[PDB]
Every structure is written in structure tokens, then in C-alpha cells.
């Protein structure tokens, strides 16, 4: 029996230059090459891509953030390429020491460079957010993408900007480094009396687990009804077909209730955004309101 995990026969035609709507066609690149590799799993067409001020700004600002961390790593490596590759995951660009508080006066080697990198990351992420809004807007679509992105930004803002300010020291922010930011995560839990007992942390885990649960359910469901064209979900919303009916009834017969072709995507978007929405709350409260989650938990 065919399972529809990989395309059996790829087909290719003229590149699809895409819908126009109110998109400024001046900022669209040409079409890229087709990828037979990607064609086995999804679409083979690469490009075009829209490139505006925000995209150029986000892209450039992002590279500067990347390059700032890069030359710090080369400096830590003594400019030796061998040392660079050996200790790559061990390098780290740390925030200013607690002595500097929220001052931007820290020397470059003493956390000033971390501040410069964070500025470029700040510009890159926020200019990229406005990009997810304006691209949907140009096509007349809803802004669900930009709002879902805000949830991820919210946790990122708490970790490196909001909470450090409320704590009164940039030293509370996360360092730029592969292993170093893993070490930061572990120390954060120990300092705050075990995050396992932060209820917003447990909620965040429930939605993270639940996101894998729901996408496995939904991905498997759509593939099981792709023999009825169930992946064409927009037309199934406008004109319910046997795919939407069999998908709903499988779950009704299994667990007693079911979704619609549209409604399941509201379950999905909320299951996912709640991960970082509750997570950011839990982190924001750690150290500002609660110093020991285990001890706090014993009284509630």
C-alpha cells in the first residue's frame, strides 16, 4: 500500500511567479533552480523571494550580529584557525558583569561587545517581524503569522531584555555561545529552586509536548485522507468533502469529539504559541517575584 510520504512521480512545469495582489513586484527576485531532492518531499521550486527595506535591514543587521560574535570567537581563539574549530562550541560572548548594572559603559572585552551584538539582533528580529506583517498585508491575508511570531519574540525579549532590566543588570541576560547558553539554562534553574516547580514552566512543557502530539495527529490525519485530496484544506473549508468528514469521524469515534478543517488550525496555532507565551511568563517571574520555585510551590 502506498503511504504518500515521498512523491512517486515528480512533475515539473513553468515556474510559478506567484500571486500579485498589492506586492511591489520591483522587489521580487527571479526564479531560482528546481530541486529534485526537495521534490520527493515537497515542492521543488526555489524562489522567487521578496527583498525590501525591512528584509535588507533585517538581513544586514542579522549578519552584523553574526559577525560581531564571530570576531569575538576569533579573538578568543587567538586568531588561530585550528583553535577556532577545536573550541568553537566553547567560545562565548558574555554580557557585562553585574558591576556595570544596566550601563552601556562596559569595555568591549568586558561586555560592551555583547551589548553591540544584542542591538543588531534586536534590529534584525524586529525588522523581520514587520516583514511577516507586510508580506501578509500585501497579499490581503490575515496577520496570524505576525501574531504567532510575537509569542516567540515575547520569550526572546524576556530572556535578554525585559527580565535583565527588571533585575537591574545586563549580567542576567543569556550569553552568545553553543555550550555557554546551555550552561546558562542549567544555572538559571538551580539558582531559582528548580524550574520543574514553576507552574508556567510545566504549562510550557505541556504545550511543547502537546505541539508534537497535535502535529503528529494532524499530519497523520491529512496524509490518511490525502487519497481524498484532504490536504487542499482551503477548499475543504469552503466546500466540505469526504476527506474532512472521514478525518473528523475518525477522531469522533476514537476520543469522542472532533474538529473542522478550519478549527483544527486554531487548535494548532494556540497549542504552539502557548509554549512561548507561558514560558515567557514563567521566566519573567523568576527572580523578580519568586526566588525559589520549589519553596514557593509548597505553599500553593
Amino acid at each position: 500500500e502506498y503511504q504518500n510520504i515521498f512523491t512517486q512521480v515528480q512533475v515539473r512545469g513553468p515556474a510559478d511567479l506567484g500571486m500579485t495582489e498589492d506586492v511591489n513586484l520591483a522587489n521580487r527576485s527571479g526564479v531560482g533552480p528546481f530541486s529534485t531532492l526537495l521534490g520527493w518531499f515537497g515542492n521543488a521550486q526555489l524562489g522567487p523571494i521578496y527583498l525590501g527595506s525591512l528584509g535588507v535591514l533585517s538581513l544586514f543587521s542579522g549578519l552584523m550580529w553574526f559577525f560581531t560574535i564571530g570576531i569575538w570567537f576569533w579573538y578568543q581563539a587567538g586568531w588561530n584557525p585550528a583553535v577556532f574549530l577545536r573550541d568553537l562550541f566553547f567560545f562565548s560572548l558574555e554580557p557585562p558583569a553585574p558591576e556595570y548594572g544596566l550601563s552601556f559603559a562596559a569595555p568591549l572585552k568586558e561586555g560592551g561587545l555583547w551589548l553591540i551584538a544584542s542591538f543588531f539582533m534586536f534590529v534584525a528580529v524586529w525588522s523581520w517581524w514587520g516583514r511577516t506583517y507586510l508580506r501578509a498585508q500585501a497579499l490581503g491575508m490575515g496577520k496570524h503569522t505576525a501574531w504567532a511570531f510575537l509569542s516567540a519574540i515575547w520569550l526572546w525579549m524576556v530572556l535578554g531584555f525585559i527580565r535583565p532590566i527588571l533585575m537591574g543588570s545586563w549580567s542576567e541576560a543569556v550569553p552568545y555561545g553553543i555550550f555557554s547558553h546551555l550552561d546558562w539554562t542549567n544555572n538559571f534553574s538551580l539558582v531559582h529552586g528548580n524550574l520543574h516547580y514553576n507552574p508556567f514552566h510545566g504549562l510550557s512543557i505541556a504545550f511543547l509536548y502537546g505541539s508534537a502530539l497535535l502535529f503528529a495527529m494532524h499530519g497523520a490525519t491529512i496524509l490518511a485522507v490525502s487519497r481524498f485530496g484532504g490536504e487542499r484544506e482551503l477548499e475543504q473549508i469552503a466546500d466540505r468533502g469526504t476527506a474532512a468528514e472521514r478525518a473528523a469521524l475518525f477522531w469522533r469515534w476514537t476520543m469522542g469529539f472532533n474538529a473542522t478543517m478550519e478549527g483544527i488550525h486554531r487548535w494548532a496555532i494556540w497549542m504552539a504559541v502557548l509554549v512561548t507565551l507561558t514560558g515567557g511568563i514563567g521566566i519573567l517571574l523568576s527572580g523578580t517575584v519568586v526566588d525559589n520555585w520549589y519553596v514557593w510551590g509548597q505553599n500553593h
Binding site: 502506498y2 512517486q8 508556567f200 487519497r227 477548499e235 486554531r266 517575584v289
Partner: protein, 240 residues
């Protein structure tokens, strides 16, 4: 009652309202619940029916308001097997021809789905300028074999989802000269043949036909795909 306790209590209240909202939004199709005789069921659950919403369909195709007066808009050739509720309803005739059970189809609009520009989303490759097979086995010309290991016909064309550049049906020529569409997800393209495990060779003629050689409507797709999937249960007696 510190700020943390207030936040976690506030969130649980929010999550309850969110679940209530999500569940009602997922009740815009198939509700209200019915008894097995079609009448409204007395117990509809604790969640109320949502208030109507309107989609404005593109290409002047009208507007959809859901929820709204439901209707199958087709006869159902089934009959109760029990006085009490909760038992299967048995086909009264040929379930594959009557389109019941795994062979069910929905009375979708008898129009083809359209792409963003108002053109037919699915077309035969012979009518799709520039489209071709770019990887894998090209099934055109191959014989089509049923679960009885008999040959039912020959692949003569591929119907392509143009916006997605995806094969969705195989057009198969039967021994009588006519053709039928086969869901791409229900065939196995091999080196020398196409094998269809859902149908026996003599059940291909029973696949519903399309009224136009260069397009297929949503209703036609549902009748075709339902019939083929129904063969898994109803064509099994002659499945080697």
C-alpha cells in the same frame, strides 16, 4: 496571595475561556447533532452552537455561511440493523455503486477547483503546456493491474495540480476505449506496471466517469476517490 499565584490563577481562567472558544469554533460543521432517524438529538452537549460566520469565496463563487441548515443532498442506501441506537446501518444494495461507507462521497459543488488566477487547478498533462515528468518512473504507457493480478488498462495521461506541480490522478484507458481517473495516492508505480490494490481489474469500469475530458469537478473527485477507497473493504473477496 503573591503576584505569581495571581498570574497562574489568571491563566487557568484564560485557558478555560480559550477551550470553550476553540470547541465552539469546531462546531461549525456537522452540528446540531441528530438522532439516527435524522431528527435533532435532545442532548447537544454543554457547548452552544457558534454564531454564523461568512466566507466570501473568490471568483464570484458566492458566499459560505457556517453554521447553517445542513443537508446531505443525496440518498443514502442504508437501513437500521437495531431498534436501539449505536449499531451499524447495513447497505441495502451495492455499497460501491450507492456510495456508502468507505465508498462514501460528499455532494460537493459540480465545479472544478480553481487556482489563484481563476483557471482549473487540475488539468491533464496533455493540456498543461510545459509540464512533464521530471523524476521517478513515468507511468504513461504502463499497464494497470488490479488486486486480482489482471490488467485493467493502460496509463494514457497524468492529471496535474498545476499550482503545486503535483500528480493527482492517472488517466487509465480501459479495454472498451473509455478512460477513468485513479487517485495517485492509491496506485503503486513500479518498473513495468502500475498496481492498484484497492480494485480488481473488473471494477475499474465502475469508477465514476467525468463529463469533460479536460477537467474534473469537486463532486467528480469525491465520487472517484470514494469509490476507489471503498474497494479496500468491498473488493476484498477477490483480492489475491
Amino acid at each position: 496571595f503573591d503576584l505569581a499565584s495571581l498570574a497562574i490563577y489568571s491563566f487557568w481562567i484564560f485557558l478555560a475561556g480559550l477551550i470553550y472558544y476553540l470547541q465552539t469554533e469546531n462546531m461549525r460543521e456537522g452540528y446540531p447533532l441528530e438522532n439516527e432517524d435524522g431528527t435533532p438529538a435532545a442532548n447537544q452537549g454543554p457547548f452552544p452552537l457558534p454564531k454564523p460566520k461568512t466566507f466570501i469565496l473568490p471568483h464570484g463563487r458566492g458566499t459560505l455561511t457556517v453554521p447553517g441548515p445542513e443537508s446531505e443532498d443525496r440518498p443514502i442506501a442504508l437501513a437500521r440493523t437495531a431498534v436501539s441506537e449505536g449499531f451499524p446501518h447495513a447497505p441495502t444494495g451495492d455499497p460501491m455503486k450507492d456510495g456508502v461507507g468507505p465508498a462514501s462521497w460528499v455532494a460537493r459543488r459540480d465545479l472544478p477547483e480553481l487556482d489563484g488566477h481563476g483557471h482549473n487547478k487540475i488539468k491533464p498533462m496533455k493540456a498543461a503546456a510545459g509540464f512533464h515528468v521530471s523524476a521517478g518512473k513515468n507511468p504513461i504507457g504502463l499497464p494497470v493491474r488490479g488486486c486480482d493480478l489482471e490488467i485493467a488498462g493502460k496509463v494514457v495521461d497524468i492529471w496535474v495540480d498545476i499550482p503545486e506541480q503535483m500528480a493527482r490522478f492517472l488517466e487509465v484507458e480501459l479495454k472498451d476505449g473509455s478512460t477513468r481517473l485513479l487517485p495517485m495516492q492509491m496506485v503503486k508505480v513500479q518498473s513495468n506496471r502500475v498496481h492498484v490494490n484497492a480494485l480488481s481489474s473488473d471494477l475499474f469500469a465502475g469508477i465514476p466517469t467525468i463529463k469533460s475530458p479536460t477537467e474534473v469537478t469537486l463532486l467528480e473527485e469525491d465520487k472517484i476517490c470514494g469509490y476507489v477507497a471503498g474497494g479496500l473493504m468491498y473488493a476484498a473477496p477477490k483480492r489475491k
